[PDB]
Ligand binder design. Structure first.
Ligand code: MG
Ligand code: MG
Ligand code: MG
Ligand code: MG
Ligand code: MG
Ligand code: MG
Ligand code: MG
Ligand code: MG
Ligand code: MG
Ligand code: MG
Ligand code: MG
Ligand code: MG
Ligand code: MG
Ligand code: MG
Ligand code: MG
Ligand code: MG
Ligand code: MG
Ligand code: MG
Ligand code: MG
Ligand code: MG
Ligand code: MG
Ligand code: MG
Ligand code: MG
Ligand code: MG
Ligand code: MG
Ligand code: MG
Ligand code: MG
Ligand code: MG
Ligand code: MG
Ligand code: MG
Ligand code: MG
Lengths: 152, 206, 51, 85, 97, 113, 124
RNA sequence: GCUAAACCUAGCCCCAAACCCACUCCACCUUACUACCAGACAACCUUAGCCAAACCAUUUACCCAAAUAAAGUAUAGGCGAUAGAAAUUGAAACCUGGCGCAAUAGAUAUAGUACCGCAAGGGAAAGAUGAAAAAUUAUAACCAAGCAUAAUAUAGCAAGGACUAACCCCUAUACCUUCUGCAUAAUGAAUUAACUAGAAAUAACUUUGCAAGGAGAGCCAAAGCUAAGACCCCCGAAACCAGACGAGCUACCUAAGAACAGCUAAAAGAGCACACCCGUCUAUGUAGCAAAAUAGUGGGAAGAUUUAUAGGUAGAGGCGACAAACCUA
RNA sequence: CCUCCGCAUAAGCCUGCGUCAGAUUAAAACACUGAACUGACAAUUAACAGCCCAAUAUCUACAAUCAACCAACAAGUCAUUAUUACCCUCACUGUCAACCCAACACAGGCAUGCUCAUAAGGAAAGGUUAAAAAAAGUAAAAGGAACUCGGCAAAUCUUACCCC
RNA sequence: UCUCUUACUUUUAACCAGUGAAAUUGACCUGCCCGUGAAGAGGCGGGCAUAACACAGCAAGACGAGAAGACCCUAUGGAGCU
């Protein structure tokens, strides 16, 4: 857990057990090429390697082999309009490796939209837009500037 | 979602977090505040949905229905009544689709209308002795009910079907709470069969 | 000696009111026509009373 | 703007505010006593009026004390009523 | 250019106010209310100058005496420096000595 | 994002759950020991003369032979009374400006209407 | 001049300053003689998860569920729903003693048990 | 017609009244924002000086108990500049305001933020549409210096007398300040917009009111007393004192380190000579690459050498192979 | 064509020429699109280096310089035992860049290891003409200091004397 | 170095294209000789000269530009030292 005071361990004391944990992680697609078993996460700063091992081996039943973490420096170069710096936050990324020969590839979540429901609150206005655009674009270079509204 | 606005920020017929709202008043901008009628949250009578009557403007006397209230400037927009015209689809080679847009009216310029004889009427917040709080007409003495308007959730209750991750109604209300002097920690530690037998020693807090 | 210009603007209206709202635009017409009246071919030929 | 109470009364106001109010009252009297010491480093005047030379007209006379400084060694042991001048 | 292009909004003033209509009422109270009150007890102002005209040095000295035990710290220091400067001015510089 | 309100729904649902569990612990602590603030502390006055709520830090040895805790100074030492008075006057100036501006804004509203 | 305003993180000082700072992770052991780290298994937190197999309760609620008034739990309510029937019943039989309150769930001192409440032994 | 110009309103100032604030979870005296261990050290101290006495050496109001009066009296004082009481008298409880400022004004403030310095510390600038911007429309144009529309015409403080005509003709030694005296080749100024410099007493004059009495206690009075009007500038030093901040440059020292190719090595605070340190001479540069450089030419280069890191000595002083040298240009 | 540079470690800064989009504008001393940039996205993964040691007594005279002769002065840069206590193990941090101090994309300053000219790293010329003056070079008939305060500068190598 | 300078290259330089400063500026439609004048005149007196305007050089003058002379004197102005 984070932002919670840990009970200090006198020697020979009970096991430190956290019940409703406070850590939220993000599986994230890598930015460079990684081997087939490396699974890149994005974890809070107050999380250790052994906490990520027990987190993935307690909640998701993922067999984990090795864990390596690092701290990423968020950029602090953007100025505001009053020249005070805007801080992109630091975060901690972690690369777990699956244990028993399992592999992993990050999915494609977005492809591919196949949808055409009835449209009233947005697509009736789109139908009005498109039908006005299909009708009214009949300009003529042979009229030379005259308005094409009068039947005369 | 939860963004603090500048202390003198204009409210401008767009939602405050929109794209053209960030276009109109960016965080750089500082302009004169619009001094406005302070109105208590108990005396404000017209809500979003009831029929009203415009008293003055380009079209006085006609009735219509409000579609939005902007309480930070005492604004209402009646449906398609106090209108002007603007072209929506605009490019560098073509612009048409001239669509009417409404213009906001103050609460002083708008009167509520009773459904019995359909005239503009003054209102009083005559609280009912039978418990509830409702508006009451002054001149004719008829109760004006608050109209049913679809809520801001974007959802309707009656044709709602539970998804896979929506809990049922009967399991949302099942009382399993047996009140006891245990904490959650020792309760789930004895429910899960976990046994700890060694003691926590003395610790010095200062 | 450190100052820049202003006014980044754009000159094309767009479809913000469906980006989220609960007030839709109140139209007063439609786009085109329902089914076009095809006139008779000899309307000037039968431009008298009847036949 | 101005303070409501003068600056030299904030000590008595702090005595009337909080836990210092719950001290026993005779201690509060002994604290707010403010009595004058006996003269140590000067000779006090005898009378209240002292006819002076160069005009035989009686004048009022007061005796003002000396601002004597007591170091912490005076707190460690019994000095007189005397300290440094 | 200094001048304004459009003439300003019309400044309308109510001459039959509440304050303007009863101005000077209960003035002249001592003369024809058999001298129970002075007309200087009608003045509502700072506690030091209520019925007292004074100089600039005299106003500052009177304000330091009557109120300077309960002023703020920076205001008290500014009043001290003002009295020092005005003594130096009025008693050493000028014409007509 | 497909539906961004789902993340807000899970966040404030879990906050409701955390509030319920904390309410149960707080009521049980009031019934068993009669104390709020399960992190125990004490009002102390630090080196700058401010009054703070110092929270305790769960050490192993008692305080009188702690080498680090004995360098932290919890007292006033009277050269800070002047700066305390100056801060008090600064707060009073800010409150006076706020109240006077409220007076003026109400006068503007009664002017316009 | 050095950068005053940006906060003092672990990436900034010399080679001795790096390593002594840390980023907020609670340590799980101690350094021994030969610069070795000795992990203590009772200090690293053990996640206590339940079996969610036959569990019928979802991360969202149906909108068809009715509403009710909020009432935050108070210690008088917990006393009334927990101990008051037992004390009421065994007082009706005249066997109630004010001397021994420990048989109704009261604890005289928290020093004995594992989950002691006021110094807050348990984590979360 | 471009640059431009214009806006009211954020807020602020002076008073009255009233005594005023501070833990959501975690972290914060060690290198503050650091979960976690054995010498326990600890605060109490007359201000000084600029300045006036036309220098200056005793001296020179500033001190925290409401007003008015006694009274600027008794007193003190190189008896001089000036300082200055006391006995005594009494001091009508409640009202939310402005012949105050309006973006060069008013708090420095949109802000103690940007920016500068190692540090104490210093410290800004600005915004303007509309009922609707989910009305980007066509207006609204007119006004400082500066330019363009639209360069020039023999001769001359730039103009005046004029004239049928711009020039041609006759007359004419720019302004302020300092001066016996300035066109002086004596100072100040490119221009425009905004801002920027006469504060008060005793005694006299005039106008009312009352009158041997005047004044809303006190004070004056052999026509006086009370009230009002009217009247005494700004910027600029080298300096002095008090308290904080500085040895990351530099002067010296301490702790534990690092570097010095090659040849002759007489043995060596030795010789030639690299890397490195320093800077004898010349040339360029002088708003430069540089608020002390570049190129050539030079001295040292196994030592009293150079240098990486940390710490120490600070101004009535530190340090100094004494240059009155250095102590953040 | 130049290289008197470069690759790393330490110190310092903190995302500061990686991808996409904008390039209508904006800083490029001009432009392409990128060192004098806007928004979004993604990286630096420890074995390298930091972060250490349970006590009470007790012990520690024979430098380094290939350490082997010889020879020294300024006299030096490295060590344990006895008893008790002790059987858990790999947690945390730095890892990017064309970068630091000099108001700057500054012919200035910057500690160590490595190859002492390279396997690294870069471009003195925007285009045209061949005026005057100026600066840096190369060459010169005869004389060789006759110039100048002074052989200053340059060229060749160069003797003797005096003051301090 | 000089008698006594000369030739060539580069930088510089002139033109073309891009970006683009600084000191200075009372206003100028800004000539020569003699004399005068606060004693050294482009602006005064007497004569002479005189269509307008670019561009590159030189430094006789504008008592030329930067630094309220650093030399001399005064201040009942400072400071260091003996
Ligand atoms: Mg003097
Ligand atoms: Mg004088
Ligand atoms: Mg201002
Ligand atoms: Mg003009
Ligand atoms: Mg003429
Ligand atoms: Mg003359
Ligand atoms: Mg003069
Ligand atoms: Mg003269
Ligand atoms: Mg002149
Ligand atoms: Mg002069
Ligand atoms: Mg001048
Ligand atoms: Mg040093
Ligand atoms: Mg040697
Ligand atoms: Mg040598
Ligand atoms: Mg020396
Ligand atoms: Mg000497
Ligand atoms: Mg690297
Ligand atoms: Mg290469
Ligand atoms: Mg060229
Ligand atoms: Mg020759
Ligand atoms: Mg000669
Ligand atoms: Mg000669
Ligand atoms: Mg030579
Ligand atoms: Mg002459
Ligand atoms: Mg002249
Ligand atoms: Mg000159
Ligand atoms: Mg002078
Ligand atoms: Mg004299
Ligand atoms: Mg003198
Ligand atoms: Mg003096
Ligand atoms: Mg001195």
């Amino acid at each position: 857990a984070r932002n919670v005071v840990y009970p200090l361990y006198r020697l020979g004391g009970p096991q430190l057990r956290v019940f409703r944990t406070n850590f939220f992680i993000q599986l994230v697609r890598p930015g460079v090429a990684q081997p087939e078993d490396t699974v890149q996460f994005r974890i809070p700063m107050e999380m250790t390697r052994v906490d990520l091992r027990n987190y993935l081996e307690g909640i998701y039943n993922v067999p984990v082999a090795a864990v390596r973490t690092r701290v990423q420096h968020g950029s602090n170069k953007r100025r505001d309009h009053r020249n005070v710096r805007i801080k992109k936050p630091d975060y901690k990324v972690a690369y777990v490796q699956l244990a028993h020969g399992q592999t992993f590839t990050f999915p494609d979540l977005f492809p591919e939209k196949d949808e055409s429901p009835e449209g009233s609150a947005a697509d009736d206005l789109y139908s009005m837009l498109e039908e006005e655009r299909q009708q009214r674009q009949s300009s003529d270079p042979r009229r030379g500037g005259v308005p094409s509204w009068f039947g005369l | 979602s939860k963004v603090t606005l500048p202390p003198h920020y204009r409210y401008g017929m767009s939602p405050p977090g929109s794209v053209a709202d960030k276009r109109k008043n960016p965080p750089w901008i500082r302009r004169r505040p619009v001094v406005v009628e302070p109105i208590s949250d108990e005396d404000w009578y017209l809500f979003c949905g009831d029929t009203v009557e415009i008293l003055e403007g380009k079209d006085a006397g006609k009735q219509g229905k409000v579609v939005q209230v902007i309480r930070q400037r005492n604004w209402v927009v009646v449906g398609g009544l106090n209108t002007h015209y603007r072209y929506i689809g605009k490019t560098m080679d073509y612009r048409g689709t001239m669509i009417p847009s409404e213009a906001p009216l103050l609460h002083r310029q708008v009167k509520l209308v009773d459904p019995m004889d359909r005239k503009p009427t003054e209102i009083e917040w005559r609280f009912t002795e039978a418990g509830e709080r409702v508006r009451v007409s002054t001149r004719s003495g008829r109760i004006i009910p608050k109209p049913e308007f679809p809520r801001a959730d974007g959802i309707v209750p009656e044709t709602w079907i539970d998804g896979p991750k929506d809990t049922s109604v009967e399991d949302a209300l099942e009382r399993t709470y047996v009140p006891c002097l245990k904490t959650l920690q020792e309760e789930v530690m004895e429910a899960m069969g976990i046994k700890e037998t060694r003691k926590y020693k003395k610790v010095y807090w200062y | 000696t450190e100052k820049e210009f202003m006014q980044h603007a754009r000159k094309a209206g767009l479809v913000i009111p469906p980006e989220k709202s609960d007030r839709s635009i109140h139209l007063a017409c439609t786009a085109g026509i329902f089914d076009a009246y095809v006139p008779p071919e000899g309307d000037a030929r039968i431009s008298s009373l009847s036949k | 703007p101005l303070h409501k109470y003068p600056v030299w009364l904030w000590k008595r106001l702090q005595l009337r505010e909080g836990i210092c109010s719950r001290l026993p009252g005779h201690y509060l009297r002994s604290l707010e006593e403010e009595r004058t010491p006996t003269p140590v480093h000067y000779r006090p005047h005898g009378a209240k009026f002292k006819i002076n030379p160069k005009n035989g007209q009686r004048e009022r006379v007061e005796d003002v004390p000396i601002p004597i400084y007591f170091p912490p060694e005076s707190q460690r042991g019994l000095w007189g009523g005397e300290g440094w001048i | 250019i200094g001048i304004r292009l459009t003439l300003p909004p019309p400044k309308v003033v109510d001459r039959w106010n509440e304050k303007r209509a009863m101005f000077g009422v209960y003035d002249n109270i001592g003369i024809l209310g058999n001298f129970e009150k002075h007309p200087k007890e009608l003045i509502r102002g700072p506690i030091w100058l209520r019925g007292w005209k004074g100089n600039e040095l005299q106003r500052c000295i009177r304000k330091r005496k009557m109120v300077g035990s309960r002023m703020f710290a920076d205001d008290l220091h500014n009043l001290n420096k003002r009295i020092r400067y005005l003594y130096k001015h009025f008693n050493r510089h000028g014409k007509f000595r | 994002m497909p539906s961004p309100e789902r993340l807000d729904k899970v966040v404030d649902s879990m906050d409701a759950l955390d509030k319920v569990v904390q309410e149960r612990e707080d009521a049980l602590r009031l019934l068993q020991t009669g104390q709020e603030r399960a992190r125990p502390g004490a009002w102390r006055r630090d080196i700058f003369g401010r009054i703070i709520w110092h929270k305790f830090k769960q050490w192993v040895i008692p305080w009188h032979l702690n080498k680090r805790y004995n360098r932290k100074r919890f007292f006033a030492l009277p050269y800070v009374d002047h700066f305390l008075r100056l801060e008090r006057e600064k707060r009073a100036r800010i409150k006076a400006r706020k109240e006077n501006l409220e007076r003026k804004k109400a006068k503007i509203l009664l002017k316009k209407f | 001049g050095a950068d005053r305003m940006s906060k003092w993180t672990s990436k900034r000082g010399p080679r001795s300053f790096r390593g002594r700072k840390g980023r907020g992770a609670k340590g799980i052991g101690f350094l021994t003689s030969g610069w070795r780290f000795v992990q203590i298994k009772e200090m690293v937190p053990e996640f206590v998860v339940p079996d969610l197999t036959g569990f019928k309760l979802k991360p969202y609620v149906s909108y068809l569920a009715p509403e009710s008034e909020e009432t935050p739990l108070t210690a008088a309510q917990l006393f009334s729903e927990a101990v008051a029937p037992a004390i009421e019943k065994d007082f009706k039989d005249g066997t109630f003693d004010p001397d021994n309150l420990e048989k109704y769930g009261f604890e005289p001192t928290q020093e004995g048990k594992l989950f002691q409440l006021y110094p807050r032994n348990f984590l979360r």
